Structure 1
Amino acid sequence: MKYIQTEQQIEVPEGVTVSIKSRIVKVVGPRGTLTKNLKHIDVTFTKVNNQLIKVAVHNGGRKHVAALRTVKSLVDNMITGVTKGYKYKMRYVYAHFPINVNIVEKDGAKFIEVRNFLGDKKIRNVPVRDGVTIEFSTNVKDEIVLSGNSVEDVSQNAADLQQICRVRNKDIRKFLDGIYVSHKGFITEDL
């Protein structure tokens, strides 16, 4: 319908700052600093009130306007990553075979080792990406915690560990064991 103009408003908390160069975006905050390249979406930025950044698209179609909102979403979603931090929690599900999950460093790889999953003798190793750290839950059995300052890096590393524990040539609806996402929380305990 060739929308003439669509806009979104990004709110910048006083604890962090964001840098814009053409379509390269970088945020600087107490937790760290992340940079993303957004040259594959063809959006427009504008700074008006320091704390407010306005995204605009001129003469964009319906499909392209749908990409306008997701630009705001990812930028705002990493704003909380540099401000609040992200914390994903998994739980271990099993029926008869306890699952042993640890962290093992082999030549600086930070591999997550999974042992005795469904009794399988094969070893499973999942790399730990940059900026994401893994910890264990306090006084709660068989719960791992993935603590990272990124959005996609933590979540993808979260899904990678989940998908490394599959069930081969069995009934999925009966063998419920494996590893799954339990809670999508933030690093800040209060928030």
Structure 2
Amino acid sequence: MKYIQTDQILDIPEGVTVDIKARVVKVTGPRGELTKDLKHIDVTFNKINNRAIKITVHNGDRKHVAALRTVKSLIANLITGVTKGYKYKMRFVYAHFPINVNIIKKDGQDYVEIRNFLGEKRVREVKIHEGVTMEISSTQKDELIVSGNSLEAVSQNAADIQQICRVRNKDIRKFLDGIYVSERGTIVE
């Protein structure tokens, strides 16, 4: 129906800065720096003050307006990742065969290696994304910790681990073995 104007407000905490220029957002905080390209969306920005930013869609239909809260959430995730960080936790689940998980460095590249999944001789290796750190928890058995500044990279890389451990040609209601995300949260709670 082409709403004349829709607005959202970005809250930027006391220790972050947000530089925006030609739909390229650069978010600096105590934990580092994150940048996101928004050239695929028609939006405009205004600086209310040092603690707030207005995001506006002029004369937008239903779908274009739907793409405004999405932008706000993506940039807010940039802020909360450069302040608090992002931590996902994965539990190793199996009935009989334990799942052997190791962080290796083949060719200077960190890889997650999964061995003995359902007794298979095949070895599964999942690349570790840049800016993401994996770690075997030393306080909970059979648990992998995925941490970083970028929620997108952290969650996608945890998903890559989860997807690589799919059971085939068996009743997956009975054969529940896998590596599953058990906790999504921040590094600095």
Q: Residue by residue, what CA displacement relative to the aligned partner does 1:132-186 show, whole Å, maximum 9, x if unpaired?
A: 1011223211011001111111110010000000111111110011110100010
Q: Residue by residue, what CA displacement relative to the aligned partner does 1:9-28 show, whole Å, maximum 9, x if unpaired?
A: 00111111111111000011
What secondary structure, in the 3-state scheme, does the structure 2 residue paired with 1:48 have?
A: strand
Count, aligned residues: 189
Structure 2: where are the runs of 5+ without partners?
Answer: none
Structure 1: where are the runs of 5+ without partners?
Answer: none
* 2:151 equivalent to 1:151: yes
- Give the aligned partner of residue 175 of structure 1: 175
- Give the aligned partner of residue 185 of structure 2: 185
- Give the aligned partner of residue 79 of structure 1: 79
CA RMSD, Structure 1 to Structure 2 (Å): 0.7
- Give the aligned partner of residue 127 of structure 1: 127
Identity %: 72
**Distance between the aligned counterparts of 1:109 and 1:122, measured in 2?**
20
What secondary structure, in the 3-state scheme, does the structure 2 residue paired with 1:13 have?
A: coil
* 2:21 equivalent to 1:29: no
**Distance between the aligned counterparts of 1:63 and 1:14, measured in 2?**
33
> Normalised by the size of structure 2, how large is the TM-score?
0.98
Aligned residue runs from structure 1 range 24-173, under 5 A: 24-173=24-173
Displacement of 1:119 in angstroms is 0.5
> Normalised by the size of structure 1, how large is the TM-score?
0.97
**Distance between the aligned counterparts of 2:54 and 2:179, measured in 1?**
40
What secondary structure, in the 3-state scheme, does the structure 2 residue paired with 1:73 have?
A: helix
- Give the aligned partner of residue 15 of structure 1: 15
What secondary structure, in the 3-state scheme, does the structure 2 residue paired with 1:82 have?
A: helix
Q: Residue by residue, what CA displacement relative to the aligned partner does 1:76-102 show, whole Å, maximum 9, x if unpaired?
A: 011100010000000000000000011
What amino acid is the match of 1:18?
A: V
